[PDB]
mmCIF file of C-alpha atoms and ligand atoms in Angstrom:
data_model
loop_
_atom_site.group_PDB
_atom_site.id
_atom_site.type_symbol
_atom_site.label_atom_id
_atom_site.label_comp_id
_atom_site.label_asym_id
_atom_site.label_seq_id
_atom_site.Cartn_x
_atom_site.Cartn_y
_atom_site.Cartn_z
ATOM 1 C CA UNK Y 7 0.000 0.000 0.000
ATOM 2 C CA UNK Y 8 2.848 2.633 -0.134
ATOM 3 C CA UNK Y 9 1.652 6.043 -1.411
ATOM 4 C CA UNK Y 10 3.776 7.788 -4.037
ATOM 5 C CA UNK Y 11 4.286 11.368 -2.840
ATOM 6 C CA UNK Y 12 6.030 12.171 -6.098
ATOM 7 C CA UNK Y 13 7.887 10.843 -9.105
ATOM 8 C CA UNK Y 14 10.976 12.550 -10.433
ATOM 9 C CA UNK Y 15 12.786 11.615 -13.655
ATOM 10 C CA UNK Y 16 15.999 12.294 -15.547
ATOM 11 C CA UNK Y 17 13.796 14.437 -17.865
ATOM 12 C CA UNK Y 18 10.162 14.763 -19.061
ATOM 13 C CA UNK Y 19 8.213 15.935 -22.101
ATOM 14 C CA UNK Y 20 5.790 18.832 -21.648
ATOM 15 C CA UNK Y 21 6.403 20.608 -24.995
ATOM 16 C CA UNK Y 22 5.896 18.191 -27.924
ATOM 17 C CA UNK Y 23 3.085 16.541 -25.925
ATOM 18 C CA UNK Y 24 2.054 16.437 -22.236
ATOM 19 C CA UNK Y 25 3.986 13.538 -20.619
ATOM 20 C CA UNK Y 26 5.377 14.708 -17.262
ATOM 21 C CA UNK Y 27 6.977 12.264 -14.827
ATOM 22 C CA UNK Y 28 3.937 12.455 -12.494
ATOM 23 C CA UNK Y 29 1.674 10.791 -15.167
ATOM 24 C CA UNK Y 30 3.497 7.562 -14.245
ATOM 25 C CA UNK Y 31 2.188 7.875 -10.665
ATOM 26 C CA UNK Y 32 -1.413 6.891 -11.447
ATOM 27 C CA UNK Y 33 -3.141 3.878 -12.985
ATOM 28 C CA UNK Y 34 -4.688 5.587 -16.039
ATOM 29 C CA UNK Y 35 -3.291 3.265 -18.765
ATOM 30 C CA UNK Y 36 -3.923 6.028 -21.275
ATOM 31 C CA UNK Y 37 -1.504 8.565 -19.811
ATOM 32 C CA UNK Y 38 2.311 8.195 -19.565
ATOM 33 C CA UNK Y 39 5.623 9.799 -18.778
ATOM 34 C CA UNK Y 40 7.936 10.365 -21.746
ATOM 35 C CA UNK Y 41 11.567 11.331 -21.380
ATOM 36 C CA UNK Y 42 12.187 14.693 -23.182
ATOM 37 C CA UNK Y 43 12.323 14.087 -26.926
ATOM 38 C CA UNK Y 44 11.620 17.613 -28.186
ATOM 39 C CA UNK Y 45 14.624 19.918 -28.810
ATOM 40 C CA UNK Y 46 16.741 20.025 -26.716
ATOM 41 C CA UNK Y 47 16.139 16.263 -26.120
ATOM 42 C CA UNK Y 48 17.455 14.334 -23.136
ATOM 43 C CA UNK Y 49 18.362 10.976 -24.686
ATOM 44 C CA UNK Y 50 19.792 9.356 -21.576
ATOM 45 C CA UNK Y 51 20.672 7.978 -19.299
ATOM 46 C CA UNK Y 52 17.013 7.645 -18.220
ATOM 47 C CA UNK Y 53 15.556 7.026 -14.810
ATOM 48 C CA UNK Y 54 12.603 7.530 -12.559
ATOM 49 C CA UNK Y 55 12.486 7.935 -8.747
ATOM 50 C CA UNK Y 56 9.339 7.397 -6.658
ATOM 51 C CA UNK Y 57 9.309 9.061 -3.262
ATOM 52 C CA UNK Y 58 7.070 7.075 -0.908
ATOM 53 C CA UNK Y 59 5.172 8.745 2.036
ATOM 54 C CA UNK Y 60 7.115 6.661 4.580
ATOM 55 C CA UNK Y 61 9.653 3.867 4.990
ATOM 56 C CA UNK Y 62 8.035 0.631 3.720
ATOM 57 C CA UNK Y 63 9.147 -2.939 3.348
ATOM 58 C CA UNK Y 64 8.907 -3.516 -0.392
ATOM 59 C CA UNK Y 65 9.511 -6.588 -2.579
ATOM 60 C CA UNK Y 66 7.981 -5.608 -5.928
ATOM 61 C CA UNK Y 67 7.865 -2.952 -8.658
ATOM 62 C CA UNK Y 68 5.032 -2.891 -11.177
ATOM 63 C CA UNK Y 69 5.796 -1.363 -14.629
ATOM 64 C CA UNK Y 70 2.989 -0.634 -17.095
ATOM 65 C CA UNK Y 71 4.412 0.255 -20.497
ATOM 66 C CA UNK Y 72 3.012 3.070 -22.573
ATOM 67 C CA UNK Y 73 -0.026 1.538 -24.307
ATOM 68 C CA UNK Y 74 -0.078 3.343 -27.691
ATOM 69 C CA UNK Y 75 3.575 3.262 -28.767
ATOM 70 C CA UNK Y 76 6.619 1.105 -28.170
ATOM 71 C CA UNK Y 77 8.809 4.262 -28.035
ATOM 72 C CA UNK Y 78 10.705 4.241 -24.745
ATOM 73 C CA UNK Y 79 9.550 0.774 -23.674
ATOM 74 C CA UNK Y 80 11.858 -0.447 -20.934
ATOM 75 C CA UNK Y 81 13.645 -3.712 -21.721
ATOM 76 C CA UNK Y 82 16.579 -3.378 -19.257
ATOM 77 C CA UNK Y 83 16.446 -1.937 -15.717
ATOM 78 C CA UNK Y 84 18.304 -1.532 -12.459
ATOM 79 C CA UNK Y 85 16.189 -1.136 -9.264
ATOM 80 C CA UNK Y 86 17.711 0.667 -6.223
ATOM 81 C CA UNK Y 87 16.333 1.744 -2.858
ATOM 82 C CA UNK Y 88 17.119 4.533 -0.436
ATOM 83 C CA UNK Y 89 16.175 5.760 2.996
ATOM 84 C CA UNK Y 90 17.444 9.332 2.605
ATOM 85 C CA UNK Y 91 16.848 10.005 -1.097
ATOM 86 C CA UNK Y 92 20.560 10.497 -1.719
ATOM 87 C CA UNK Y 93 22.239 7.132 -1.026
ATOM 88 C CA UNK Y 94 20.935 4.228 -3.128
ATOM 89 C CA UNK Y 95 21.565 0.475 -2.945
ATOM 90 C CA UNK Y 96 21.080 -1.741 -6.001
ATOM 91 C CA UNK Y 97 18.540 -4.494 -5.198
ATOM 92 C CA UNK Y 98 17.761 -5.918 -8.666
ATOM 93 C CA UNK Y 99 18.984 -5.871 -12.313
ATOM 94 C CA UNK Y 100 17.312 -7.560 -15.327
ATOM 95 C CA UNK Y 101 15.609 -7.457 -18.714
ATOM 96 C CA UNK Y 102 11.877 -7.200 -19.642
ATOM 97 C CA UNK Y 103 10.145 -8.545 -22.716
ATOM 98 C CA UNK Y 104 9.475 -6.263 -25.671
ATOM 99 C CA UNK Y 105 5.638 -6.052 -25.540
ATOM 100 C CA UNK Y 106 3.114 -3.686 -23.946
ATOM 101 C CA UNK Y 107 2.188 -6.164 -21.186
ATOM 102 C CA UNK Y 108 2.338 -5.038 -17.495
ATOM 103 C CA UNK Y 109 5.651 -6.147 -15.948
ATOM 104 C CA UNK Y 110 6.686 -7.063 -12.399
ATOM 105 C CA UNK Y 111 10.145 -6.826 -10.938
ATOM 106 C CA UNK Y 112 10.545 -8.813 -7.712
ATOM 107 C CA UNK Y 113 13.320 -8.905 -5.130
ATOM 108 C CA UNK Y 114 13.865 -9.759 -1.465
ATOM 109 C CA UNK Y 115 11.974 -7.620 1.017
ATOM 110 C CA UNK Y 116 13.862 -4.405 1.694
ATOM 111 C CA UNK Y 117 13.088 -1.175 3.517
ATOM 112 C CA UNK Y 118 12.748 1.807 1.144
ATOM 113 C CA UNK Y 119 11.473 5.372 1.205
ATOM 114 C CA UNK Y 120 12.729 6.040 -2.397
ATOM 115 C CA UNK Y 121 12.764 3.542 -5.252
ATOM 116 C CA UNK Y 122 14.771 4.342 -8.359
ATOM 117 C CA UNK Y 123 14.296 2.723 -11.724
ATOM 118 C CA UNK Y 124 17.313 3.190 -14.011
ATOM 119 C CA UNK Y 125 16.572 2.416 -17.639
ATOM 120 C CA UNK Y 126 19.579 0.503 -18.930
ATOM 121 C CA UNK Y 127 17.890 -0.564 -22.249
ATOM 122 C CA UNK Y 128 14.819 0.636 -24.131
ATOM 123 C CA UNK Y 129 13.171 0.092 -27.503
ATOM 124 C CA UNK Y 130 11.554 2.262 -30.163
ATOM 125 C CA UNK Y 131 9.525 1.932 -33.359
ATOM 126 C CA UNK Y 132 12.285 4.041 -34.991
ATOM 127 C CA UNK Y 133 15.234 2.391 -36.769
ATOM 128 C CA UNK Y 134 17.947 4.181 -34.806
ATOM 129 C CA UNK Y 135 15.985 4.791 -31.573
ATOM 130 C CA UNK Y 136 17.385 2.122 -29.205
ATOM 131 C CA UNK Y 137 17.948 3.679 -25.824
ATOM 132 C CA UNK Y 138 16.870 7.206 -26.942
ATOM 133 C CA UNK Y 139 13.504 7.275 -25.156
ATOM 134 C CA UNK Y 140 11.914 6.125 -21.909
ATOM 135 C CA UNK Y 141 8.172 5.853 -21.313
ATOM 136 C CA UNK Y 142 5.937 4.473 -18.554
ATOM 137 C CA UNK Y 143 2.134 4.497 -18.193
ATOM 138 C CA UNK Y 144 2.713 3.569 -14.541
ATOM 139 C CA UNK Y 145 5.446 2.665 -12.098
ATOM 140 C CA UNK Y 146 4.260 1.483 -8.692
ATOM 141 C CA UNK Y 147 5.743 -0.339 -5.659
ATOM 142 C CA UNK Y 148 4.360 -3.125 -3.404
ATOM 143 C CA UNK Y 149 5.302 -5.064 -0.276
HETATM 144 C C1 LIG N 1 8.792 4.233 -37.906
HETATM 145 C C2 LIG N 1 8.974 5.574 -37.250
HETATM 146 O O1 LIG N 1 10.031 6.188 -37.428
HETATM 147 N N1 LIG N 1 7.963 6.046 -36.496
HETATM 148 C C3 LIG N 1 7.883 7.427 -35.995
HETATM 149 C C4 LIG N 1 7.352 7.521 -34.532
HETATM 150 O O2 LIG N 1 8.281 7.022 -33.582
HETATM 151 C C5 LIG N 1 6.955 8.939 -34.103
HETATM 152 O O3 LIG N 1 6.217 8.837 -32.882
HETATM 153 C C6 LIG N 1 6.556 9.836 -31.897
HETATM 154 O O4 LIG N 1 7.922 9.773 -31.499
HETATM 155 C C7 LIG N 1 8.271 10.597 -30.399
HETATM 156 C C8 LIG N 1 9.759 10.497 -30.173
HETATM 157 O O5 LIG N 1 10.353 10.738 -31.420
HETATM 158 C C9 LIG N 1 7.443 10.264 -29.151
HETATM 159 O O6 LIG N 1 7.566 8.919 -28.698
HETATM 160 C C10 LIG N 1 5.994 10.573 -29.504
HETATM 161 O O7 LIG N 1 5.159 10.293 -28.404
HETATM 162 C C11 LIG N 1 5.581 9.725 -30.708
HETATM 163 O O8 LIG N 1 4.263 10.075 -31.088
HETATM 164 C C12 LIG N 1 3.327 8.965 -30.893
HETATM 165 O O9 LIG N 1 3.245 8.000 -31.943
HETATM 166 C C13 LIG N 1 2.844 8.544 -33.214
HETATM 167 C C14 LIG N 1 2.893 7.534 -34.375
HETATM 168 C C15 LIG N 1 1.492 9.306 -33.098
HETATM 169 O O10 LIG N 1 0.390 8.473 -32.761
HETATM 170 C C16 LIG N 1 1.621 10.356 -31.998
HETATM 171 O O11 LIG N 1 0.439 11.128 -31.941
HETATM 172 C C17 LIG N 1 1.970 9.610 -30.692
HETATM 173 O O12 LIG N 1 2.079 10.471 -29.589
HETATM 174 C C18 LIG N 1 6.157 9.653 -35.223
HETATM 175 C C19 LIG N 1 5.941 11.140 -34.951
HETATM 176 O O13 LIG N 1 4.550 11.398 -34.989
HETATM 177 O O14 LIG N 1 6.770 9.553 -36.509
HETATM 178 C C20 LIG N 1 7.047 8.252 -36.991
HETATM 179 O O15 LIG N 1 5.818 7.608 -37.219
HETATM 180 CA CA1 CA N 2 -0.752 6.911 -16.105
#
């Protein structure tokens, strides 16, 4: 049940379309965060940090890909946790399948107030777009 106080990101798009980082902090499958693609683009590295309302014991991250485009779809991730928002500890690394299905990332129970998702790999419907974008309809945490 942890509440996301806020989501911050490496970057966000509010100019070419409305896709701020906070759109990834609700369960509307029809809104998403997009890394900044409009000039000047931020083309990586990409990440997203959820600040929880308290310290929780967490063992799972849910990731809902953007539903209308594969652009930015996360296929490689590192998950880290923090108590103070500054010092992070890696708890999980892995790949995710290249489809729009909801993903889960699971690890041993760990106390966190902040959960960071580093995008190590991402896909695109563009020929030379590997790694350029990051999108998320939702990122959430569970314990
Ligand atoms: C094959 C190919 O090159 N396709 C591109 C496609 O990737 C582009 O989509 C947009 O790309 C930017 C980043 O460059 C963002 O991801 C945009 O959200 C994305 O737009 C979305 O998809 C398109 C197809 C439209 O439905 C748009 O309204 C969506 O938001 C488009 C640019 O429109 O061009 C090529 O089709
Ligand atoms: Ca959403």
